[PDB]
């Protein structure tokens, strides 16, 4: 009993030349694609007005092929899972913050979160990093001016997620840019081959909170893109993945992993716990995270009776299933957020 998971790098937003080769290799192989993970860079687009959040040099203002799902006119063949990069609707994806649904089959993983499917544990972290904004908040609703900022990493997701490798194992974890230092963890004089310009940065190459978070939740699997670049590496257990970008055959690699039971996409009950206790440090939606609360320490009163009266509730306003919704993502952005105050005030 084995599922074939297809592992994505950069999309930007050629998305009908992936499910095109994704579509060619099930009925190439005969073997059948569970669904399909992505490490970012997925432009999505709406309509022209989402080029503003687009933070790409003038040659790359384009609408690419995403607006064609938003529309209805395409429709993705699988269940696509992904988080987000640096090339993106910035404005979209700060709505969907908490995750949503973009679109038919394409779920957003938001800022930060864990899922579970097929009886796997997937943890997500979106964006790349950049010093000077890591402590920097967000502010709601996204700014034309706040386009050079959105898409960086935050540090406050390392203690959102410092939790989650303690009840079980995490199997699948993605981030856009590499672990700092898991470069030197693989055949680098092969990859300095490839680019001779990823040995100026040598072992600094890479996110530092990606390593504190692959250090810390101890992963099967960790897949990342942004380079443009396939390369493998071995830190302890952790079966690092770099894909390429879509154009180039090397972006696509496929994980044969075992089935245990076919489970629909939902909801991660560790992070769902995660998500309501930390609710005072996000009450303010017009900036959030108040990092003047200690998200380490709000996560520090949960117990383990409290957790599962955090899922009922949870699943009678919200559902454990993730389900498709086709609201605005402004509204989702309010409907969410008001089903986990409502959640929290009820403990
Ligand atoms: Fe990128
Ligand atoms: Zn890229």
Same mark, same amino acid.
């Given at each position: 009993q084995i599922q074939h998971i297809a592992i994505v790098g950069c999309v930007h937003g050629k998305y009908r030349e992936m499910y095109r080769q994704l579509s060619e290799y099930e009925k190439s192989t005969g073997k059948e694609i569970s669904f399909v993970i992505c490490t970012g860079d997925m432009q999505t687009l709406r309509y022209e007005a989402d080029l503003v959040y687009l933070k790409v040099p003038p040659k790359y203002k384009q609408m690419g092929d995403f607006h064609l799902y938003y529309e209805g006119k395409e429709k993705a063949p699988y269940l696509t899972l992904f988080i987000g990069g640096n090339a993106e609707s910035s404005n979209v994806l700060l709505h969907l913050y908490n995750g949503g649904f973009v679109c038919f089959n394409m779920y957003y993983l938001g800022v930060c979160s864990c899922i579970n499917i097929n009886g796997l544990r997937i943890v997500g972290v979106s964006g790349i990093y950049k010093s000077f904004d890591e402590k920097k908040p967000y502010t709601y609703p996204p700014s034309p001016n706040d386009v050079v900022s959105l898409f960086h990493t935050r540090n406050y997701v390392i203690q959102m997620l410092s939790n989650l490798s303690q009840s079980s194992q995490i199997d699948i974890s993605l981030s856009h840019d590499w672990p700092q230092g898991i470069v030197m963890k693989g055949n680098y004089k092969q990859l300095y081959r490839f680019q001779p310009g990823f040995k100026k940065?040598?072992?600094?190459?890479?996110?530092?909170?990606?390593?504190?978070?692959?250090?810390?939740?101890?992963?099967?699997?960790?897949?990342?893109?942004?380079?443009?670049?396939?390369?493998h590496a071995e830190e302890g257990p952790t079966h690092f993945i770099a894909l390429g970008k879509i154009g180039y055959?090397?972006?696509?690699?496929?994980?044969?992993?075992?089935?245990? @039971?076919?489970? !629909? #996409?939902? $909801?991660?009950?560790?992070?769902?716990c995660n998500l309501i206790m930390t609710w005072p440090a996000?009450?303010?939606?017009? @900036?959030?995270? !108040? #990092?003047? $609360?200690?998200?380490?320490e709000l996560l520090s009163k949960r117990t383990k009776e409290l957790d599962k009266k955090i899922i009922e509730l949870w699943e009678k306003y919200i559902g454990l299933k993730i389900i498709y919704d086709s609201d605005t993502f402004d509204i989702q952005f309010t409907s969410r957020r008001f089903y986990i105050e409502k959640i929290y005030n009820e403990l």
């Open positions: 940065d040598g072992a600094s190459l890479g996110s530092p909170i990606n390593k504190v978070i692959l250090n810390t939740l101890k992963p099967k699997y960790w897949i990342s893109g942004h380079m443009h670049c396939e390369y055959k090397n972006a696509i690699s496929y994980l044969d992993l075992p089935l245990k @039971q076919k489970t !629909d #996409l939902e $909801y991660d009950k560790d992070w769902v996000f009450s303010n939606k017009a @900036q959030f995270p !108040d #990092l003047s $609360y200690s998200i380490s």
